[PDB]
Swiss-Prot record:
Annotated tissue distribution: Widely expressed, enriched in testis compared to other tissues.
PPIase FKBP-type domain sequence ranges: 30-118
Residues of the full protein shown: 16 to 139 of 457
Gene name, Swiss-Prot/TrEMBL: FKBP5
Localisation: Cytoplasm; Nucleus
Organism domain of life: Eukaryota
Result, substituting residue 16 to Q: Mimics acetylation; impaired interaction with AKT1 and PHLPP1
Effect of residue 16 to R: Decreased acetylation; promotes interaction with AKT1 and PHLPP1
Organism: Homo sapiens
Record PTM: Acetylation impairs ability to promote interaction between Akt/AKT1 and PHLPP1. Deacetylation by SIRT7 promotes interaction between Akt/AKT1 and PHLPP1, leading to suppress Akt/AKT1 activation.
Protein's recorded name: Peptidyl-prolyl cis-trans isomerase FKBP5
Classification lineage: Eukaryota, Metazoa, Chordata, Craniata, Vertebrata
C-alpha cells in the first residue's frame, strides 16, 4: 500500500540522509542473512510510477531479476535497498530520481525526474 506511508515513516537508508531511498519492511527476512557486494542476488519485484501505474514487474515474465550486488548494474536505490535486505524479506522502497533515473529518465517507461516505488522480494543470494 501507500507510498505516502513510506514517505512519512520509512527508514532513510542513504549514507547522506537526504531521504532519497526510504524503506519499510513488509515481510521479515530469514536468518539475520544478507548478501555482500559482489554476491549474486535473485529478486522478485514490482515498479510503480508515483501515479500508481506499473512500469515494470518480474511477475510479467514470471522471471526473477538477477544481478551482482554493489556493482552499479542496477539503479542506486537497488544496490542500496537490496544490501539492507535479509533473505526471504519483502520491502517497499520509495526512491528519489537522484538514486533512480535522475532528470534524464528512462523513456518510454520512466519520464524525467521520476520518483519510483518498488516492492522487492529477495528470494536468494549466492557467493
Amino acid at each position: 500500500g501507500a507510498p505516502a506511508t513510506v514517505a512519512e515513516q520509512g527508514e532513510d537508508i542513504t549514507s547522506k540522509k537526504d531521504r532519497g531511498v526510504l524503506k519499510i519492511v513488509k515481510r521479515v527476512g530469514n536468518g539475520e542473512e544478507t548478501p555482500m557486494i559482489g554476491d549474486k542476488v535473485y529478486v522478485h519485484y514490482k515498479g510503480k510510477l508515483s501515479n500508481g501505474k506499473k512500469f515494470d514487474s518480474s511477475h510479467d515474465r514470471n522471471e526473477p531479476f538477477v544481478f551482482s550486488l554493489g556493482k552499479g548494474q542496477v539503479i542506486k536505490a537497488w544496490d542500496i535497498g537490496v544490501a539492507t535486505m535479509k533473505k526471504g524479506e519483502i520491502c517497499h522502497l520509495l526512491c528519489k530520481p537522484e538514486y533512480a533515473y535522475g532528470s534524464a529518465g528512462s523513456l518510454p517507461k520512466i519520464p524525467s525526474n521520476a520518483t519510483l516505488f518498488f516492492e522487492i522480494e529477495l528470494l536468494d543470494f549466492k557467493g
